[PDB]
Amino acid sequence: STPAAPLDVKCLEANKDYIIISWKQPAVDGGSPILGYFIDKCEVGTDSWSQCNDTPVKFARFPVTGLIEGRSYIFRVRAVNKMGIGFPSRVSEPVAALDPA
């Protein structure tokens, strides 16, 4: 009854101050509408996950902030419906918090 995991977590843009991520809605919503999404981050050296947003976001392209310039991060997304929070997506590829070019 909680939703399935979001799919295909990806990075659209990175710089040292924010990283934009997207994903795709889960194919299964648990029989209730997806109310939104939690995006978690984990520094590549670690196993410690932090929640990037306090309240779910409806949309599928989140700017992650609270980054340390030069550290690299992997991300996951959890979907929420009225029943609660589903299991996290597969983790993303690593992204460095560096300005491009």
Residue numbers in the entry: 508 to 608
Paper text:
The ability of OL3:My4L to transition from the solution conformation to that observed crystallographically suggests that the LH helix might have a degree of flexibility. We explored this by solving the crystal structure of My4LH (myomesin residues 510–618) in two different space groups (data collection and refinement statistics in Table 1). In space group P65 (2.05 Å resolution), all four My4LH independent molecules in the a.u. display clear electron density until residue A608, while residues E609-S618 (LH) cannot be modeled. The My4 domain displays the typical Fn-III fold made of seven anti-parallel β-strands organized in two separate β-sheets (A-B-E and C-C′-F-G) arranged in a β sandwich. Overall, SAXS and crystallographic analyses support a model in which interdomain freedom allows the transition from a relatively compact solution conformation to an open one that can be stabilized by homodimerization.
Obscurin, or its homolog obscurin-like-1, bridges the giant ruler titin and the myosin crosslinker myomesin at the M-band. Myomesin is a 185 kDa modular protein that localizes exclusively at the M-band, where anti-parallel dimers cross link myosin filaments. In addition to a mechanical role, myomesin is also needed for the integration of obscurin and its smaller obscurin-like-1 homolog at the M-band (Fukuzawa et al., 2008). Yeast two-hybrid and biochemical analyses have mapped the obscurin/obscurin-like-1:myomesin interaction to the linker region (L) located between the fourth and fifth Fn-III domains of myomesin (My4 and My5, respectively) and the third Ig domain of either obscurin or obscurin-like-1 (O3 and OL3, respectively) (inset) (Fukuzawa et al., 2008).
